[PDB]
Amino acid sequence: AVAAGA
Length: 6
What we know:
By secondary structure, this protein is mostly loops. Helices cover 0% and strands 0% of the residues. It contains no helices and no strands. The chain is rod-shaped. The termini are far apart.
């Protein structure tokens, strides 16, 4: 699982 941002 990989998550970037906001």
